């Protein structure tokens, strides 16, 4: 039941000792189930979707942008950069940097996307351009992940992010070729096996982007193609009161199991 989804999400949140935000859009009938859907949450790494999408949008006018070589220098390495470090003292294209940011959460890759866009404001300006008035990216990697309670920097709401992810992956925020590029990248994510994907039927195709940060913040945003019905968009955000809390990918998998019962 619908009531079971709300009761079980609240019970999951309580037993985890954190704050849980969920938004599920069913595009078959334009319905959306919410839990704390209008509360702000730190996005952490899920903001890489908007950075990659903003570069995709730029490439609709600068048609060769994704093939531009970008120098990877040791000074560009931050804390976690498993693909960029393979190419240090060489180049990666913006397409490769987008894929690395999305599929491995590479932080050097993210920072190159941000720099291409003129800073974090370039990502946020793209959000405004497609009608998202809630999203805000304010910092680069790694400090965008500080996840301080009450700090609006680098936050959005589940409702806002589910709507925007829907427009990017299923709607018309991007050109058709750019939408295909983004979806291809998301379907190739390597970081999400224990998060939303672990709570859904295995026959459903998933493209997702995880996030992780301080305050045990553990996030995932997904576009989902079930067999036999219209696609879904699912956002699961989770954050905790102690700065050094452990991540809880299992809470996102549980949230996915719970909310799927309302379909």
């Amino acid at each position: 039941q619908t009531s079971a989804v709300q009761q079980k999400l609240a019970a999951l949140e309580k037993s985890s000792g954190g704050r849980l935000g969920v938004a599920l859009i069913d595009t078959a009938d334009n319905t959306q189930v919410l839990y704390r859907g209008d509360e702000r949450f730190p996005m952490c790494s899920t903001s890489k979707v908007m950075a990659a999408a903003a570069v995709l949008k730029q490439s609709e006018t600068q048609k060769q942008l994704l093939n531009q070589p970008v120098e990877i220098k040791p000074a560009d390495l931050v804390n976690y950069n498993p693909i960029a470090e393979k190419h240090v003292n060489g180049t990666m294209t913006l397409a490769e940097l987008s894929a690395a940011a999305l599929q491995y959460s590479d932080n050097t890759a993210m920072n190159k996307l941000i720099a291409q866009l003129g800073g974090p404001g370039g990502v946020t300006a793209f959000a405004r351009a497609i009608g998202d008035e809630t999203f805000r990216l304010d910092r680069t990697e790694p400090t965008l992940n500080t996840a301080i309670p009450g700090d609006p920097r680098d936050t959005t709401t589940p409702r806002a992010m589910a709507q925007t992810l829907r427009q990017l992956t299923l709607g018309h925020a991007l050109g058709e070729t750019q939408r295909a590029q983004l979806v291809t990248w998301l379907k190739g994510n390597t970081t999400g096996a224990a998060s939303i994907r672990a709570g859904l039927p295995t026959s459903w195709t998933v493209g997702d982007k995880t996030g992780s940060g301080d305050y045990g913040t553990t996030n995932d945003i997904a576009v989902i193609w079930p067999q036999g019905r219209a696609p879904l968009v699912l956002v699961t955000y989770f954050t905790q009161p102690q700065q050094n809390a452990e991540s809880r990918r299992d809470v996102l998998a549980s949230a996915a199991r719970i909310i799927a019962e309302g379909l």
Partner: protein
């Protein structure tokens, strides 16, 4: 558990073959291809937004190629971290690795990446060290005071720090 570990990372040596890497790492932990090219990438415990890991690069795609590159994230912990901002500020480009370690503390650092572009010749070796204050290293989340120091041919070419005090 048997996933990728720092012990395994230390056991794998420059010069080893692909099958040696897989045997030591545990083949189920490892992958090649895709964004890793002909490198072998082996995963450990969950950490940050993605697992602790090692990546091993090889001299070629040939089945008999040798390890010429080792990179790791959150597999190795510093043995006795004592880095401070004051110590970091005494480091200068042009210092040898030995000079850097004498400044930041012999047990403050771990090897982030190490690459021999002319293997087995050591000419042009690049080295990235991560160095940590006493409570800066974490095997699962963000560092609490860390630095990146990068070398070519054993000579410091650059440095950056985050949150040192």
């Amino acid at each position: 558990a048997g996933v990728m570990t720092g012990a395994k990372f230390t056991q794998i040596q420059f010069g080893m073959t692909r099958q040696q890497v897989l045997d030591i790492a545990g083949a189920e932990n490892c992958e090649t291809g895709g964004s890793f090219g002909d490198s072998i990438h082996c995963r450990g415990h969950a950490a940050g937004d993605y697992y602790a890991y090692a990546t091993f690069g090889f001299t070629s795609a040939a089945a008999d190629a040798k390890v010429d590159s080792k990179s790791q994230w959150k597999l190795l912990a510093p043995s006795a971290p004592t880095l401070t901002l004051a110590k970091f500020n005494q480091v200068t480009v042009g210092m040898t690795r030995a000079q850097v370690l004498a400044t930041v503390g012999q047990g403050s650092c771990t090897t982030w990446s190490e690459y021999y572009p002319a293997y087995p010749s050591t000419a042009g070796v690049t080295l990235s060290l991560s160095c940590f204050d006493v409570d800066g290293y974490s095997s699962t989340g963000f560092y609490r005071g860390s630095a990146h120091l990068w070398f070519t041919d054993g000579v410091l070419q650059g440095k950056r720090q985050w949150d040192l005090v």
